[PDB]
Write a sequence for this structure.
């Protein structure tokens, strides 16, 4: 039975929340539509995403039916389909955010009782309402495929023919294939597919491209561990040798580059992992490195070709007295030009080719040159630029870290040593590759120390963002909650955080039941383990609304405390669903292992530094000391004391509870100041609206931040004008008096007018873009405003590399799947410091990570 | 059906008068050796090497065998399996060996044909089956004919040795029930088909779609087969999807299957994947298809130049820091190192991206004073050529007669969309023709296939138009069908100065039966191919060594007589083969798809027939009239009579019972089976040199005269006293006796002994070199008349001094004489001199269309970087 904490039955889901109307549009130097209706306090980057990312533009009719069901209530009856109107208006597109809200949360609760997740009809609406309130309050949101593909058959009756998509009955447990692609929604965007050492059969190499391409066609991402593939030189039973791992990786990389995510600008999300003991590991590590060099040589050689080949055209037309010019015997400078196209390594074929054109009386040569733009032809020529490539490393390899031991790259066919190598020498290649370009790293022993069901195999791979780590051929449904939107007044709504987690743990399962999967194996494996992926975001957005730095043990404490609460309330919620409907079919097989993941969790939640069973690196305990504790750190010990006790009685409905996803698109309709576990990137940003947009404003985070500290209202406006500027040169900048000030704060003049970069005008008319060296503010209270990058042109302080990592390790001891992250390092970063970030990550109990040095790639 | 004997007697068997002897085959680097090779005495060392290293079953052949008695099966046709009881009397190493004699190959080849043909009811009596068994093996031993390599690899392994294995994804149709089945075994049903034409639909991930095609293609590449597909059904780039968004275009998905083909070795060997990609001239992306390989060759060259420049210019940066005095960061800055500022200057003058100059600077700061920047070259197998795309495909363009008309009329050309059929973009037809000319002139691609000439001879239009071909463009039929090939060595039918037409008709009939039995015995790599191959049963009988036959008859390749002979021999082959098909349809019925295409095929047969009677008119529904059989110029008037009689009988029997097979003849390249047959020339090709290298058993070669040169000059009438002087002019006297430029001396009398005997190697280290090692040509030779000189023209000039060769026109007109009597097409790639222009390449494509040719391809010498 579910409660009611944010709504009343009399007011419904929208009592206390207003409503407005805005207009979304595009145009180049013509997609439009204006009726789009959006709730209160909603931004337009929120409103505009929903208008063409999540709205349906056609296919719903004007007014349509209910259907008689008898199981459960009237308000959750499906809708199904024109002589009222002409050919038009039988053809309408969505227009209000409540239309999608009611079809998302309605289809949630509709299927929800079909499975019997409710006790009474009173719970159905008390859940149908309570969840729409969090959608309108931007409190939480599921993954984007749910924002559109859920509830079109429930609320509108949209349907069509289908194939390839297979599901299972929620009541019988039988494998079925779909006759419709809409009546069974598709809530999953992550997939961890498998691949075998085989070409043409199912589950093989060429089959995987067929499996990935139907994923890419729908918009989902996929990740695969390819180390099952035998290396280059491994023999064939009745033939010769294999081409190698990289040769087949380039087939899939080329296929990902040609298949768009549903046809739009979005690239294909694809992850390519390889074990450290693979014979072709050095080719895998240096894949992006040498392909990046091919891009560099393509632009250098093409320009050198275009120049020299025209200088050879020079000597034949500089000749006046004939065309004896083709001969490299008697011409003004053709003997100089042929040795000028040599000299620069131009192949002899294209030099004779150019004078072969001249003998036909030809004017030109069409030799295109290439650049370093990322959508160029050069990058499309090379491989790798469509895959995220990580490396699976065992703790044994990083125990040859210290002993300077020898590493065995073992063959796949006959499990025999193919080549020996110093481990640090191989570790040296990993540091250089990521320093210049990739690969990411995933610690195989750390991720499997928290694997809930190892009897069904080891954790071998991840999704394109390394956030979801379960068995192969498993999907996952996602949802993240905007953290700061429970924060009104000075306390934080723990009353609502656990109600949000408990309620959102349930809706995620209901689409493990509601779903229709792109393959039959993934369909059953999903039903068998009912994996979940609940996360949070915007924690960096509140951590200074809090009033305390991102790089602060007082902040990692709060992070690990609410990360413990969410995952604890989620596991305890899943144990409550296992007593009413039964644990997931794969639990009893692994009841001994899954329960050990949970006791290791709350041992890390009780702050204990010891007592861990089966972990390779003991997780970072939760800081009992430095947490602000608005009745919180004890609440984290409360849920896992209850999740362990409840799970011991009924098991668990889900094998995994939580993740941390890069809530990029989904964090925009939520008005999340920061995304995922990240901090904010600036104290100054912009924002669009109807007619024209991107009038610059001040990050509303630090007005409320300094309000938390001892400060008067006019006594922080203080610094906003110091940071956003005055929008005029009207009174005492260095470019006032004399040489029309309706630039209206764009923050350029269309100088050569003698101005020794005295752009304190920019510091004046447009603000310092930073609070470093600001009026009034106490020195000890500015580290609480450090961002991801140095704020502004003259800002110099930022959150260091360990600030990002230590924040991660504090949360990962209380999350099922890894935290997705790529930390920017300064251009100064050396190869030693790059491995230092990886080596620090494993010692801190992190499962996966990714680096990027500033200015390292030609894609700048 | 009755099978007669012409080459054997029942008492003599298959090898009566055929002597067998044993040789040695060996391979190594500056590895594998077979000390056991038994071959017919006439076989060369090269043919033995091909047999031993490619066709012999190298392992798994049991040393003791035992027959499996079957009911109704003659005893000599019984299967055999390992004799497990008698194998245990041997050391474990001797129980399963490899094949050792050509007889084993011959026996298991014809044994399986006779065995399966018997169960299929193809033989009237046991005597006919034994005659077939005997005549088949005799021809194989006598190098008169050969099936395509997959038959040499695979046919008879299960029938002769019981060799078996598991099988997935392969299918066949039961000859008795007609129901589709799945193979339990990988060897019981042989896989004799080498070429496949495959369809693809405008779909990404459904069966028959794009990604599924790569799976199908990969399945063929693993076994060693080649693929051909017309991709014109794929959406143009920018065509909207009804689910929202555009398609990324045809070239993007072509890049996928091209990258897959480069990563899959055909047959697992060092061989490359045989892949044919075809686009229609009205496709919206036709411009990117035409200039595809043109741009990729530039990308290769840019990689060669850009990498070496990146190497050279970035090493100098290190040398500027290493020879700096010793502050090593007042060394990394160019403000304190004058030589370093010169290096960065020379690096940016080379257009090297500065994002890469900051890296090597930051790299030197940490202590490393070295870097590996790999540099690429123009070799075909190196990393540069596999980085780019297209290299794993033969790109052909499919041209309509209306387009060629629009080029003549300077009309404009619409590029039709695939979804709605509306005009994507209008282009001038002539400038589109100029790109095809410029592309093929620069990087050999694209080739061309004439859609209307191909479908003018399509015998089964009710089941669709011929849309594509096989990798070498000889097989042309419906999509999702295969074809088994076999070629006859024409020269073997020439002895005592006359062409044994009676035996040629005999070999055609028996090999037509053989190829049809191969359809019945086969298993196929997909259900649709298995069903369609069962329903139409296309055969690919062909020939080789017509150029070697022409030279042996004293006829030039570029002559009316040589073209009239090939047309007659091609008319007899296809005529007898079609008449044999019609007779087989008399006893067992026409193929399932014939009844609805009868009026269509019989029309094709009539045009073949009227082409045989010499009529320059009398063709039904044909866009470009074929080259009718030259009646007055053929050197043997009896062959012109036999051609007319064969097509009269082929149509008469077709009118009665139809035909067992929808296609029947083809001209394959015969590259490997030509070596095993010891054909002087392959397919329709002429010869290439007047002196050749003979391979010795242990290793090394030594040059000899083209064996057809003495036979030619005899036919023309040159006396034996003149023959030896003409040959020694070409091959040389081997060793410095008779020279008039530098010979005997004034010196060594001791080291002279075998200074001189060491002069046959023919490296020679003025015109004294031409004396001992020969001119290697016949122009300017003693005794030889000037009107007989063209008889020795070859595709390439011979020797360093030789200057005449066969014209491009000679090649094309020889094709046109044969194409009129070929079911499919003729695999040909014409090599043109480096001096050729873009207009001359288009003229070659234009001349081929006007002469009834179905497809062609050109390679200008020196055009590709791949050519050393
Ligand atoms: N023709 C080929 N060229 C190159 N690599 C190939 C080829 N065929 C297969 N491979 C590679 C792909 C895989 O890495 C590996 C196994 O492929 P496949 O032969 O289908 O497996 P298999 O399970 O049948 O084993 P085996 O080949 O030993 O019988 O060999
Ligand atoms: N996501 C994609 N990105 C790029 N091209 C795509 C994508 N999906 C399909 N295509 C291309 C592949 C083909 O060229 C063409 C049709 O493929 P597909 O959409 O699967 O066909 P379909 O038969 O389902 O038709 P339709 O898209 O009209 O419903 O579009
Ligand atoms: Mg295999
Ligand atoms: Mg589609």
């Amino acid at each position: 039975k579910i409660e009611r904490k944010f709504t009343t039955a009399e007011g419904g889901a929208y009592g206390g929340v207003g409503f407005t109307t805005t207009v979304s549009e595009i145009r180049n130097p013509v997609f439009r539509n204006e009726s789009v209706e959006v709730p209160e306090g909603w931004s337009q980057v929120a409103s505009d995403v929903l208008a063409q990312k999540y709205f349906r533009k056609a296919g719903v009719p004007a007014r349509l039916k209910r259907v008689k069901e008898k199981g459960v209530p009237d308000f959750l009856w499906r809708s199904v389909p024109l002589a009222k109107l002409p050919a038009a208006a039988r053809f309408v597109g969505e227009t209000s955010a409540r239309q999608v809200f009611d079809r998302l949360a309605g289809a949630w609760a509709y299927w929800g009782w079909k499975g019997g997740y409710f006790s009474t009809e009173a719970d159905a609406r008390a859940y149908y309402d309570e969840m729409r309130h969090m959608l309108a309050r931007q409190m939480a949101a599921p993954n984007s495929p749910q924002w559109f593909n859920t509830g079109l058959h429930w609320a509108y009756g949209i349907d069509g023919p289908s194939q390839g998509h297979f599901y299972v009955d929620h009541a019988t447990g039988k494998l079925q294939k779909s006759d419709s692609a809409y009546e069974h929604p598709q809530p999953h965007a992550c997939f961890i597919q498998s691949v075998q050492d085989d070409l043409v059969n199912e589950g093989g190499i060429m089959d995987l491209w067929v499996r990935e391409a139907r994923l890419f066609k729908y918009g989902s991402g996929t990740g695969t561990n390819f180390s099952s593939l035998r290396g280059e030189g491994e023999k064939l039973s009745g033939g010769g040798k294999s081409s190698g791992l990289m040769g087949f990786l380039k087939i899939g990389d080329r296929a990902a580059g040609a298949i768009k995510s549903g046809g739009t600008t979005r690239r294909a999300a694809k992850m390519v992992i390889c074990d450290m003991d693979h014979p072709d590991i050095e080719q895998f590590i240096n894949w992006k490195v040498i392909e990046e060099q091919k891009v560099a040589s393509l632009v250098a050689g093409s320009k050198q070709h275009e120049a020299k080949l025209n200088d050879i055209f020079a000597a034949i037309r500089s000749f006046d007295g004939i065309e004896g010019a083709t001969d490299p015997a008697g011409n003004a400078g053709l003997k100089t030009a042929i040795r000028a196209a040599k000299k620069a390594m131009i192949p002899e074929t294209y030099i004779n080719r150019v004078l072969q054109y001249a003998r036909q009386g030809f004017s030109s040569i069409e030799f295109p040159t290439y650049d370093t733009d990322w959508d160029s032809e050069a990058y499309t020529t090379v491989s790798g630029q469509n895959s995220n490539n990580s490396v699976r490393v065992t703790d044994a390899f990083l125990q040859a870290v210290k002993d300077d031991a020898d590493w065995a790259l073992v063959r796949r066919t006959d499990g025999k040593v193919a080549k020996t190598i110093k481990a640090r020498e191989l570790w040296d290649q990993v540091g250089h590759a990521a320093w210049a370009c990739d690969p990411g790293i995933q610690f195989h022993d750390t991720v499997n120390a928290w694997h809930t069901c190892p009897e069904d195999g080891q954790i071998r791979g991840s999704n394109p963002c390394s956030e979801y780590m379960f068995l192969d051929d498993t999907a996952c449904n996602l949802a993240s909650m905007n953290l700061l939107t429970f924060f009104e007044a000075g306390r934080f709504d723990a009353e609502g955080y656990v109600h949000a987690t408990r309620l959102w743990t349930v809706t995620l399962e209901i689409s493990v039941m509601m779903a229709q999967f792109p393959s039959k194996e993934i369909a059953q494996l999903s039903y068998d383990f009912r994996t979940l992926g609940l996360g949070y975001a915007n924690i960096g957005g509140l951590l200074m609304n809090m009033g305390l730095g991102y790089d602060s043990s007082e902040g990692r404490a709060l992070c690990g405390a609410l990360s413990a609460i969410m995952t604890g309330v989620a596991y305890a919620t899943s144990a409550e669903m296992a007593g009413e409907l039964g644990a997931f079919s794969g639990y009893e097989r692994n009841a001994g292992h899954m329960l050990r993941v949970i006791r290791n969790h709350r041992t890390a939640a009780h702050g204990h530094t010891t007592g861990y069973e089966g972990v390779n690196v003991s997780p970072v305990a939760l800081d009992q000391v430095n947490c602000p504790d608005p009745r919180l750190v004890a609440l984290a010990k409360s849920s896992w004391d209850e999740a362990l006790r409840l799970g011991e009685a009924h098991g668990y409905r889900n094998a995994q509870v939580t993740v941390i996803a890069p809530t990029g698109t989904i964090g925009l309709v939520m008005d999340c100041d920061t995304t995922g576990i990240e901090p904010d990137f600036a104290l100054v940003k912009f924002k669009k609206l109807a007619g024209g947009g991107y009038f610059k404003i001040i990050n509303r985070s630090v007005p409320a931040a300094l309000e938390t500290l001892g400060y008067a209202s006019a006594q922080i406006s203080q610094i906003v004008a110091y940071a956003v500027g005055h929008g005029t040169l009207a009174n005492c900048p260095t470019i006032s008096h004399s040489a029309k000030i309706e630039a209206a704060l764009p923050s350029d003049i269309r100088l050569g007018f003698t101005r020794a970069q005295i752009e304190a005008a920019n510091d004046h008319v447009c603000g310092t873009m930073t609070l470093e060296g600001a009026p009034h503010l106490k020195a000890e209270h500015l580290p609480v405003f450090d961002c991801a990058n140095p704020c502004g042109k003259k800002g110099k302080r930022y959150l260091s590399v360990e600030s990002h990592i230590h924040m991660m390790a504090a949360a990962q001891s209380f999350i099922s799947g890894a935290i997705s992250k790529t930390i920017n390092m300064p251009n100064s970063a050396t190869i030693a410091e790059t491995l230092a970030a990886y080596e620090l990550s494993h010692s801190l109990g992190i499962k996966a990570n990714a680096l990027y040095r500033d200015g390292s790639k030609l894609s700048q």
In short: The CA atoms of residues 662 and 779 of chain A lie 33 Å apart. The two ends of chain A are 54 Å apart (CA to CA). Chain A has 25 helices and 22 strands. The longest strand of chain A covers residues 270-275.
